[PDB]
């Protein structure tokens, strides 16, 4: 069975001695000593510690030195990490380290000869211990108050962001709220200790998202002083002090100090096996007639739309145990063996015995390829009775019987002593019959439940001695909010009441004209004969409460306002029209600056980003959300009716947009709104580069790469106006064409190539080996390196392009003897932050325009539909001038003052008007704090968070403390909502911050936080909240399928679920959410477990699930993840 | 402690069990015996492999690689309290182990023995040395006897046989009539040169006046390397010693042509081919 | 800057955004040392400055330098 | 068989062969970095740059033309 280590071909000497190359092989299977590595989990993968490469390399150094690690105080420099390594659950991975002992260089390769890491390392000769000094401001008389972050508090906030660090790596013991001071635990492992140091850096306040290392500038370890710096706690364990100084960008800990440890963003890779189940919770009648009749669209004979599960369900919770033996006759043709193994597998508490029986062995053949996967017991059977037992199913195209043909039917069930449990009549003559055949009844107990006191509880705890009172029926005539339905599911499978036949009857008339609920008479028995476990009643229909799957469509809206942003970095199949935050509100303040787009143009960055070639880390400006970040040019009309053309820091690709005083210009009577929509970026970019920054003077020489391009054409035009020697390069024959035509002043000496390095030669000829005065480079690696060489003496390098910069490539520092000057040029850096320098750039455009210098570029114009395509097109350098997106056929001839009528298919994303205030009870709670954060991001300026004691944790202090520094208005309240006087106090508290637009009930302890609070808030909210947008409540599937030991948690929840359905009927917002296990910070972890046959939803999933739910019609919806 | 075991030793421990029970004896019956173990082993490659990385590689690999263990650890597990020995004589070895044991049994010492031969080809450098001495066949084959003989073609094997006194054998493949070894003196033509004039002597010492009748030989298994120089030297001195007799005396052949020169295992690998056919 | 190797490298880091590196000293230049090309995202501009290059080439640029002295 | 390309090579000190005896020179190669570097017996820096196999060896580079007679 087990196969063992066979020394391999490549295992014995194969060249000669080299005290300077090492291969390290790493096994991660639980046996290996290097199993500790599995605790460096990140986003779900086990990635080799960036820190590890340093360790490897360091080891390697001392090897070559004949020394051991503890004797080789090491120094690193300019280390770069390039890719990281993804350790597989099993097998080995190899990493080689090579060492250039004179260059002091080094470099780490993987098995595939890939570049993993590189820099300089060497023995530190004069190890100065004064470097790792841990001294303070002064004497802080500040303990027993203070507020620090607990080891738990830390890796909690991290695992939130994406860092699934495991136990062996959780070495941050304690930490200053700001992440500037703390204590790291010694592990007798540098891989860990070092990576913890990184932790601390990553742990800035307000810093979000997923960040790995990428560059260090100067690591410096001295195990000699590291021993001395270390200490022993009372725990007996070991640790030392760690300090972060983000003004100096150094982290220090024990005997190791990092200097300049830049890190950077990575993409979270959704693992589509954790896609949560989204169900709606409509009431469903047992008497559904005229069903369907909406489907525009065999498909006709086969009716699998929702009302199949509608009864399968009813039938399923009508037995004590979540185990159901199902069978089906006439199976090969009317194929039910394909559906219900999916309808039951949907729920998280299933135990399925399916049986597929056909008269012949023949029809059970297309099934061997199916019944195999479905796990269905097959056989032989013909409708003549003899049977070789919970439900039986059949398609003709006291358990349960589902049937489907295509009055006479209803008397063929009266003979077999069946009661029509369910009836689904289709518009086209397809009817569904469920049937339950009843075994004589027992002592039918009856207890109503409307009294607030909960007196019936010592009443029901008494009905548990009764040996076998088969019919035990709970009911409530008073409260239209009785929470029985939920109560039931909890008891219906709690040991004592297992076979209790726990039934229920409820009165939820939703309109005032809708009475009809009298017992002891006629209908008390109509519902007792059907025996259905759950019997509810709304305005005249007798049905139970069923869970149907969700309609799935990412809710769209009819908007005058939308912008477009890649739903996933790197792939343009998820480019969509996103509801713009002007669609939620527009304060007089931001309002005069509003402006409607006719054309929006792509620029290179819009591309490279939607790609993933350029990180969002290289984009100037400080960013709330690094998401919505695409589009910077547009043309249209401001609220003046006037006719403008301009730039925008981001979100430019849109219907509508907010101008920037200092970067909007009036578009000339003689320019189509199209041509206009190409000018800004390009010439702005050109002038900032040639004139302002390079100081290009007349009769100087300039090499402008890719004049074929947009920025190129502009660059050329401008350099011609001060009449200089032009040298442009170009990819395509036809691009030589265009340019030659357009700029006539161009010789053939002007043109070189761009696919190539050839242009250096070409430029050195007609330059007489003299070179050019300014180069406007926007080109690759070897090509930039070659452009640097076309530099004449005293000349200037204008660096636009960002690829080489972004990768910290090297520049040959001796180009600087030519008295050359080298210019890094990002117009982004100006632009928004609209300084003096920029105003200068703008007035070169203003002037240039009025002197003909600046002119519209050729446009390739895509309709507002084919937007995707517009990208792929600009992707391929197969264009000449700007690629432009038309959003509004422009207004024609005779002077048209217009008023636009735009209807757009815009996807819904919840956004907060910045004048409204939002209230979250249980607001400092693990999950509350996150809804708080998430609310802010979607734009909330005013938060009222509720807690009993106020702020007690460090991690609570931190969030709130920050949100106030970010300028969010946050009021921590000690007010409780289960008292109308308290509720009014709260809703009033919020109203001071501004009109209340959001109320989220998260408080939980039982039926005072949840039921009584929900109730009050409903009232107060009605009375005096005319601007309320959202009204949300957090349930739990405890009320759903049921939990043993929380029948009290259950009642309280189902209750809120009624008051929501109220508000819905009444045209108000309302929404209860039945959550499965809630993960990262719920009451659970405080993430691999299995509570209630499910899985802890990662809060991140929750929050985006909330997005979806918040913009839905239905009152109650469920969201949980499946176990197995 | 197993992943740091030389695979020879791994599959030796198995074959020599597979071998003892091959002869109808339950191994345990030998536990505590004055029974012994002789191993013909020339190449312990696995040994060096797990002896380089002086932080990686563990200290008890040597209880699982050090040549002495090819026998010492076979003696260990089977509880053979008699002589435990490894011999190295290049290609000869395993046969000379089988000689050495026979002699030990013959004269009291033991009641039975484990004769083993082992050769596993792990490091290519080894072959590379051989090729540079020309003894490896580029053709990659053992042209036993044929003229197209370049050189030989190295092959691996673990093989083992159980010797015993007849008054104790539940099964007998054959009986050993004689055996002995000498050593090509000092040849003028170099050390690698097979001295057929000496091999001739060795073959006489064991027949005519001092042993069996050269006429009874039905088959002789040759070393049969396939050397352009070896082959002739051997087969010559063979007849030059075994043939004053009628009929087609010895039908001759080599297993090394069927499978490759198993080097120090060669001897016993061959014996097996013989015994196999006899049956 | 008019300073050694690690020291120049370190002076490059004291650069604020949009800032300018005035390079007088010639040792590091002369040996074609390397410059970390990502300092250029700070919208920094890097200046090789040899007054020699002007001086006898008594150009316009130099006349400007002279009149700052005057 | 290995049409090579160098880049940015620097020579640092040169080596003074003595009339007799031997001098040693080591060359080390970073196969992913494409880097390289030459040390002497004393572990001194002799030479450094980038080397690699030239994949698309274009013979039109070694044209000895130009049209000035």
mmCIF file of C-alpha atoms in Angstrom, chain A residues 238-519:
data_model
loop_
_atom_site.group_PDB
_atom_site.id
_atom_site.type_symbol
_atom_site.label_atom_id
_atom_site.label_comp_id
_atom_site.label_asym_id
_atom_site.label_seq_id
_atom_site.Cartn_x
_atom_site.Cartn_y
_atom_site.Cartn_z
ATOM 1 C CA UNK A 238 8.351 34.596 25.840
ATOM 2 C CA UNK A 239 7.900 37.881 23.978
ATOM 3 C CA UNK A 240 9.366 41.323 23.343
ATOM 4 C CA UNK A 241 8.373 44.857 22.475
ATOM 5 C CA UNK A 242 7.457 45.902 18.939
ATOM 6 C CA UNK A 243 7.169 49.510 17.655
ATOM 7 C CA UNK A 244 5.827 50.958 14.421
ATOM 8 C CA UNK A 245 6.641 54.497 13.300
ATOM 9 C CA UNK A 246 4.781 55.186 10.077
ATOM 10 C CA UNK A 247 6.387 58.585 9.846
ATOM 11 C CA UNK A 248 9.709 56.755 9.643
ATOM 12 C CA UNK A 249 8.172 53.567 8.096
ATOM 13 C CA UNK A 250 10.207 51.386 10.404
ATOM 14 C CA UNK A 251 9.014 48.468 12.541
ATOM 15 C CA UNK A 252 11.279 47.186 15.286
ATOM 16 C CA UNK A 253 10.859 44.099 17.459
ATOM 17 C CA UNK A 254 13.380 42.528 19.788
ATOM 18 C CA UNK A 255 16.477 42.254 17.604
ATOM 19 C CA UNK A 256 15.024 42.804 14.157
ATOM 20 C CA UNK A 257 14.128 46.043 12.509
ATOM 21 C CA UNK A 258 12.482 46.636 9.185
ATOM 22 C CA UNK A 259 12.977 49.930 7.353
ATOM 23 C CA UNK A 260 10.761 50.768 4.437
ATOM 24 C CA UNK A 261 8.662 47.685 4.282
ATOM 25 C CA UNK A 262 6.173 48.621 1.575
ATOM 26 C CA UNK A 263 3.443 46.006 0.966
ATOM 27 C CA UNK A 264 0.528 45.861 -1.501
ATOM 28 C CA UNK A 265 -2.981 44.896 -2.503
ATOM 29 C CA UNK A 266 -4.078 41.467 -3.602
ATOM 30 C CA UNK A 267 -7.401 40.260 -5.050
ATOM 31 C CA UNK A 268 -9.757 38.148 -3.011
ATOM 32 C CA UNK A 269 -10.559 34.987 -5.018
ATOM 33 C CA UNK A 270 -14.153 33.997 -4.239
ATOM 34 C CA UNK A 271 -14.268 30.242 -3.662
ATOM 35 C CA UNK A 272 -17.624 29.412 -5.303
ATOM 36 C CA UNK A 273 -18.223 26.403 -3.031
ATOM 37 C CA UNK A 274 -19.217 28.896 -0.299
ATOM 38 C CA UNK A 275 -21.999 30.480 -2.314
ATOM 39 C CA UNK A 276 -24.882 30.923 0.242
ATOM 40 C CA UNK A 277 -28.469 29.798 -0.314
ATOM 41 C CA UNK A 278 -30.882 32.642 -0.932
ATOM 42 C CA UNK A 279 -34.528 31.857 -0.256
ATOM 43 C CA UNK A 280 -37.632 34.076 -0.050
ATOM 44 C CA UNK A 281 -40.394 33.601 2.525
ATOM 45 C CA UNK A 282 -43.785 34.284 0.940
ATOM 46 C CA UNK A 283 -46.945 32.913 2.476
ATOM 47 C CA UNK A 284 -48.342 30.135 0.302
ATOM 48 C CA UNK A 285 -52.023 29.079 0.134
ATOM 49 C CA UNK A 286 -53.152 25.418 -0.025
ATOM 50 C CA UNK A 287 -55.634 26.697 -2.609
ATOM 51 C CA UNK A 288 -53.523 28.199 -5.420
ATOM 52 C CA UNK A 289 -55.679 28.595 -8.531
ATOM 53 C CA UNK A 290 -54.808 30.071 -11.941
ATOM 54 C CA UNK A 291 -51.134 29.662 -11.040
ATOM 55 C CA UNK A 292 -48.481 30.575 -13.619
ATOM 56 C CA UNK A 293 -50.146 32.513 -16.440
ATOM 57 C CA UNK A 294 -47.067 34.765 -16.563
ATOM 58 C CA UNK A 295 -44.430 32.585 -18.230
ATOM 59 C CA UNK A 296 -44.105 33.942 -21.793
ATOM 60 C CA UNK A 297 -42.765 30.447 -22.648
ATOM 61 C CA UNK A 298 -41.287 19.530 -22.903
ATOM 62 C CA UNK A 299 -41.467 22.849 -21.087
ATOM 63 C CA UNK A 300 -45.257 22.891 -21.091
ATOM 64 C CA UNK A 301 -46.089 19.405 -19.791
ATOM 65 C CA UNK A 302 -43.450 19.755 -17.087
ATOM 66 C CA UNK A 303 -44.392 22.166 -14.233
ATOM 67 C CA UNK A 304 -41.361 22.454 -11.906
ATOM 68 C CA UNK A 305 -41.808 26.134 -11.055
ATOM 69 C CA UNK A 306 -41.889 26.722 -7.242
ATOM 70 C CA UNK A 307 -45.292 25.147 -6.404
ATOM 71 C CA UNK A 308 -43.682 21.662 -6.503
ATOM 72 C CA UNK A 309 -41.505 22.375 -3.472
ATOM 73 C CA UNK A 310 -44.493 24.262 -2.054
ATOM 74 C CA UNK A 311 -46.025 20.942 -1.058
ATOM 75 C CA UNK A 312 -43.010 18.677 -0.832
ATOM 76 C CA UNK A 313 -42.145 21.160 1.935
ATOM 77 C CA UNK A 314 -45.509 21.008 3.745
ATOM 78 C CA UNK A 315 -45.151 17.232 3.641
ATOM 79 C CA UNK A 316 -41.548 17.306 4.856
ATOM 80 C CA UNK A 317 -41.852 19.044 8.203
ATOM 81 C CA UNK A 318 -45.008 17.026 8.798
ATOM 82 C CA UNK A 319 -42.944 14.147 10.137
ATOM 83 C CA UNK A 320 -40.994 14.308 13.405
ATOM 84 C CA UNK A 321 -37.605 13.386 11.917
ATOM 85 C CA UNK A 322 -35.752 15.118 9.011
ATOM 86 C CA UNK A 323 -35.537 11.628 7.459
ATOM 87 C CA UNK A 324 -38.001 10.795 4.680
ATOM 88 C CA UNK A 325 -38.329 7.551 2.716
ATOM 89 C CA UNK A 326 -39.577 8.659 -0.695
ATOM 90 C CA UNK A 327 -40.652 6.435 -3.570
ATOM 91 C CA UNK A 328 -42.021 7.037 -7.110
ATOM 92 C CA UNK A 329 -44.110 4.927 -9.527
ATOM 93 C CA UNK A 330 -44.193 5.457 -13.325
ATOM 94 C CA UNK A 331 -40.706 6.951 -13.022
ATOM 95 C CA UNK A 332 -38.935 6.654 -16.401
ATOM 96 C CA UNK A 333 -41.257 9.059 -18.231
ATOM 97 C CA UNK A 334 -42.632 11.563 -15.717
ATOM 98 C CA UNK A 335 -39.149 12.176 -14.307
ATOM 99 C CA UNK A 336 -39.421 13.326 -10.642
ATOM 100 C CA UNK A 337 -36.166 11.602 -9.770
ATOM 101 C CA UNK A 338 -34.328 14.625 -11.195
ATOM 102 C CA UNK A 339 -36.082 17.366 -9.220
ATOM 103 C CA UNK A 340 -36.881 16.424 -5.614
ATOM 104 C CA UNK A 341 -33.404 15.062 -4.840
ATOM 105 C CA UNK A 342 -32.624 18.747 -5.468
ATOM 106 C CA UNK A 343 -35.622 20.180 -3.578
ATOM 107 C CA UNK A 344 -34.722 18.300 -0.387
ATOM 108 C CA UNK A 345 -30.923 18.541 -0.727
ATOM 109 C CA UNK A 346 -31.652 22.264 -0.646
ATOM 110 C CA UNK A 347 -32.459 22.144 3.076
ATOM 111 C CA UNK A 348 -29.591 21.672 5.598
ATOM 112 C CA UNK A 349 -31.297 18.972 7.632
ATOM 113 C CA UNK A 350 -31.997 16.153 5.133
ATOM 114 C CA UNK A 351 -31.780 12.358 5.312
ATOM 115 C CA UNK A 352 -33.045 11.033 1.967
ATOM 116 C CA UNK A 353 -34.176 7.520 0.936
ATOM 117 C CA UNK A 354 -35.365 7.866 -2.658
ATOM 118 C CA UNK A 355 -36.854 4.952 -4.620
ATOM 119 C CA UNK A 356 -37.385 4.902 -8.447
ATOM 120 C CA UNK A 357 -39.584 2.024 -9.647
ATOM 121 C CA UNK A 358 -40.642 1.304 -13.229
ATOM 122 C CA UNK A 359 -42.728 -1.522 -14.717
ATOM 123 C CA UNK A 360 -39.809 -2.599 -16.915
ATOM 124 C CA UNK A 361 -36.004 -2.815 -16.534
ATOM 125 C CA UNK A 362 -35.832 -0.712 -19.719
ATOM 126 C CA UNK A 363 -36.881 2.831 -18.773
ATOM 127 C CA UNK A 364 -34.479 2.564 -15.809
ATOM 128 C CA UNK A 365 -31.508 2.880 -18.180
ATOM 129 C CA UNK A 366 -31.084 6.616 -18.822
ATOM 130 C CA UNK A 367 -31.163 6.535 -15.029
ATOM 131 C CA UNK A 368 -28.044 4.435 -14.389
ATOM 132 C CA UNK A 369 -26.196 7.576 -15.512
ATOM 133 C CA UNK A 370 -28.462 9.596 -13.200
ATOM 134 C CA UNK A 371 -29.690 7.379 -10.289
ATOM 135 C CA UNK A 372 -26.005 6.713 -9.688
ATOM 136 C CA UNK A 373 -25.290 10.375 -8.783
ATOM 137 C CA UNK A 374 -28.758 10.875 -7.211
ATOM 138 C CA UNK A 375 -28.298 7.806 -5.019
ATOM 139 C CA UNK A 376 -31.714 6.316 -5.763
ATOM 140 C CA UNK A 377 -32.845 2.751 -4.991
ATOM 141 C CA UNK A 378 -34.311 1.452 -8.295
ATOM 142 C CA UNK A 379 -36.705 -1.452 -8.942
ATOM 143 C CA UNK A 380 -39.784 -2.866 -10.720
ATOM 144 C CA UNK A 381 -43.485 -2.079 -10.162
ATOM 145 C CA UNK A 382 -46.800 -1.867 -12.098
ATOM 146 C CA UNK A 383 -49.957 0.045 -10.834
ATOM 147 C CA UNK A 384 -51.806 -3.134 -9.758
ATOM 148 C CA UNK A 385 -50.969 -2.865 -6.015
ATOM 149 C CA UNK A 386 -48.428 -5.486 -4.766
ATOM 150 C CA UNK A 387 -45.628 -3.764 -2.804
ATOM 151 C CA UNK A 388 -42.170 -5.403 -2.314
ATOM 152 C CA UNK A 389 -42.666 4.413 3.495
ATOM 153 C CA UNK A 390 -42.981 8.189 4.185
ATOM 154 C CA UNK A 391 -43.999 9.766 0.836
ATOM 155 C CA UNK A 392 -44.828 8.539 -2.690
ATOM 156 C CA UNK A 393 -44.491 10.664 -5.842
ATOM 157 C CA UNK A 394 -45.782 10.203 -9.409
ATOM 158 C CA UNK A 395 -45.952 12.046 -12.759
ATOM 159 C CA UNK A 396 -48.808 10.936 -15.071
ATOM 160 C CA UNK A 397 -47.482 12.979 -17.991
ATOM 161 C CA UNK A 398 -50.826 8.748 7.479
ATOM 162 C CA UNK A 399 -47.976 9.877 5.219
ATOM 163 C CA UNK A 400 -47.975 11.732 1.907
ATOM 164 C CA UNK A 401 -48.821 11.234 -1.755
ATOM 165 C CA UNK A 402 -47.991 13.651 -4.557
ATOM 166 C CA UNK A 403 -49.577 13.181 -7.985
ATOM 167 C CA UNK A 404 -49.923 15.159 -11.233
ATOM 168 C CA UNK A 405 -52.410 14.589 -14.090
ATOM 169 C CA UNK A 406 -53.359 16.949 -16.962
ATOM 170 C CA UNK A 407 -63.633 17.117 -9.697
ATOM 171 C CA UNK A 408 -63.654 13.506 -10.824
ATOM 172 C CA UNK A 409 -60.226 13.454 -9.272
ATOM 173 C CA UNK A 410 -61.498 14.764 -5.938
ATOM 174 C CA UNK A 411 -63.882 11.814 -5.492
ATOM 175 C CA UNK A 412 -61.181 9.234 -6.305
ATOM 176 C CA UNK A 413 -59.483 10.390 -3.093
ATOM 177 C CA UNK A 414 -62.657 10.213 -1.004
ATOM 178 C CA UNK A 415 -62.571 6.458 -1.576
ATOM 179 C CA UNK A 416 -59.033 5.833 -0.337
ATOM 180 C CA UNK A 417 -59.855 7.932 2.770
ATOM 181 C CA UNK A 418 -57.468 10.742 1.687
ATOM 182 C CA UNK A 419 -57.769 14.460 2.409
ATOM 183 C CA UNK A 420 -56.574 16.808 -0.334
ATOM 184 C CA UNK A 421 -53.766 18.490 1.554
ATOM 185 C CA UNK A 422 -52.771 20.669 -1.415
ATOM 186 C CA UNK A 423 -54.107 21.843 -4.780
ATOM 187 C CA UNK A 424 -52.149 23.783 -7.376
ATOM 188 C CA UNK A 425 -54.250 24.553 -10.478
ATOM 189 C CA UNK A 426 -52.279 25.838 -13.488
ATOM 190 C CA UNK A 427 -53.732 28.185 -16.121
ATOM 191 C CA UNK A 428 -53.107 25.605 -18.867
ATOM 192 C CA UNK A 429 -54.833 22.671 -17.111
ATOM 193 C CA UNK A 430 -51.895 21.255 -15.126
ATOM 194 C CA UNK A 431 -53.007 20.493 -11.567
ATOM 195 C CA UNK A 432 -51.033 19.295 -8.548
ATOM 196 C CA UNK A 433 -52.519 17.096 -5.812
ATOM 197 C CA UNK A 434 -50.924 16.307 -2.486
ATOM 198 C CA UNK A 435 -52.635 13.661 -0.368
ATOM 199 C CA UNK A 436 -52.398 12.594 3.264
ATOM 200 C CA UNK A 437 -54.321 9.525 4.467
ATOM 201 C CA UNK A 438 -55.346 9.987 8.110
ATOM 202 C CA UNK A 439 -54.994 7.558 11.054
ATOM 203 C CA UNK A 440 -57.749 8.079 13.712
ATOM 204 C CA UNK A 441 -57.096 10.953 16.155
ATOM 205 C CA UNK A 442 -56.434 11.041 19.919
ATOM 206 C CA UNK A 443 -56.929 13.551 22.746
ATOM 207 C CA UNK A 444 -56.671 16.872 20.860
ATOM 208 C CA UNK A 445 -55.188 19.369 23.363
ATOM 209 C CA UNK A 446 -55.721 23.128 22.793
ATOM 210 C CA UNK A 447 -53.654 26.055 24.170
ATOM 211 C CA UNK A 448 -53.855 29.649 22.905
ATOM 212 C CA UNK A 449 -50.894 31.996 23.054
ATOM 213 C CA UNK A 450 -51.638 35.732 23.022
ATOM 214 C CA UNK A 451 -50.981 36.597 26.668
ATOM 215 C CA UNK A 452 -47.773 38.613 27.084
ATOM 216 C CA UNK A 453 -46.903 36.858 30.359
ATOM 217 C CA UNK A 454 -45.839 33.567 28.716
ATOM 218 C CA UNK A 455 -48.117 31.598 31.066
ATOM 219 C CA UNK A 456 -48.657 28.822 28.505
ATOM 220 C CA UNK A 457 -45.013 27.747 29.036
ATOM 221 C CA UNK A 458 -45.585 25.959 32.342
ATOM 222 C CA UNK A 459 -48.733 24.804 30.497
ATOM 223 C CA UNK A 460 -46.788 23.191 27.634
ATOM 224 C CA UNK A 461 -44.045 21.864 29.917
ATOM 225 C CA UNK A 462 -46.945 19.962 31.527
ATOM 226 C CA UNK A 463 -48.155 18.489 28.191
ATOM 227 C CA UNK A 464 -44.846 16.608 28.020
ATOM 228 C CA UNK A 465 -45.757 13.976 30.638
ATOM 229 C CA UNK A 466 -48.840 12.923 28.660
ATOM 230 C CA UNK A 467 -47.605 9.659 27.119
ATOM 231 C CA UNK A 468 -49.126 9.891 23.627
ATOM 232 C CA UNK A 469 -51.518 12.840 23.167
ATOM 233 C CA UNK A 470 -51.092 12.611 19.371
ATOM 234 C CA UNK A 471 -52.943 15.842 18.412
ATOM 235 C CA UNK A 472 -51.382 18.782 20.334
ATOM 236 C CA UNK A 473 -52.387 22.108 18.716
ATOM 237 C CA UNK A 474 -50.971 25.582 19.527
ATOM 238 C CA UNK A 475 -52.834 28.725 18.466
ATOM 239 C CA UNK A 476 -53.316 32.457 18.956
ATOM 240 C CA UNK A 477 -56.335 34.602 18.096
ATOM 241 C CA UNK A 478 -55.153 37.965 19.426
ATOM 242 C CA UNK A 479 -51.619 38.994 18.390
ATOM 243 C CA UNK A 480 -51.210 39.421 14.638
ATOM 244 C CA UNK A 481 -47.597 38.834 15.694
ATOM 245 C CA UNK A 482 -47.637 35.626 17.704
ATOM 246 C CA UNK A 483 -44.379 34.015 16.575
ATOM 247 C CA UNK A 484 -45.925 30.547 16.692
ATOM 248 C CA UNK A 485 -44.748 29.491 13.237
ATOM 249 C CA UNK A 486 -41.192 29.940 14.547
ATOM 250 C CA UNK A 487 -41.851 28.600 18.041
ATOM 251 C CA UNK A 488 -43.203 25.459 16.348
ATOM 252 C CA UNK A 489 -40.241 24.614 14.130
ATOM 253 C CA UNK A 490 -38.165 24.694 17.350
ATOM 254 C CA UNK A 491 -40.370 22.315 19.377
ATOM 255 C CA UNK A 492 -41.489 20.222 16.368
ATOM 256 C CA UNK A 493 -38.112 18.484 16.641
ATOM 257 C CA UNK A 494 -37.055 18.951 20.271
ATOM 258 C CA UNK A 495 -36.885 15.510 22.025
ATOM 259 C CA UNK A 496 -40.051 15.694 24.176
ATOM 260 C CA UNK A 497 -42.344 16.913 21.397
ATOM 261 C CA UNK A 498 -40.783 14.928 18.523
ATOM 262 C CA UNK A 499 -43.901 12.922 17.574
ATOM 263 C CA UNK A 500 -46.096 15.527 19.315
ATOM 264 C CA UNK A 501 -47.786 16.393 15.989
ATOM 265 C CA UNK A 502 -47.114 19.966 17.068
ATOM 266 C CA UNK A 503 -49.647 21.871 14.978
ATOM 267 C CA UNK A 504 -50.443 25.580 14.885
ATOM 268 C CA UNK A 505 -53.113 28.102 13.925
ATOM 269 C CA UNK A 506 -52.587 31.829 13.461
ATOM 270 C CA UNK A 507 -54.494 35.020 12.655
ATOM 271 C CA UNK A 508 -52.634 37.446 10.413
ATOM 272 C CA UNK A 509 -55.177 39.571 8.631
ATOM 273 C CA UNK A 510 -53.124 42.218 6.829
ATOM 274 C CA UNK A 511 -55.917 44.641 5.808
ATOM 275 C CA UNK A 512 -58.524 45.947 8.251
ATOM 276 C CA UNK A 513 -61.403 44.704 6.004
ATOM 277 C CA UNK A 514 -60.065 41.112 6.228
ATOM 278 C CA UNK A 515 -61.562 39.218 9.238
ATOM 279 C CA UNK A 516 -62.678 35.570 9.396
ATOM 280 C CA UNK A 517 -61.210 33.593 12.298
ATOM 281 C CA UNK A 518 -63.717 31.701 14.499
ATOM 282 C CA UNK A 519 -63.008 28.302 16.212
#
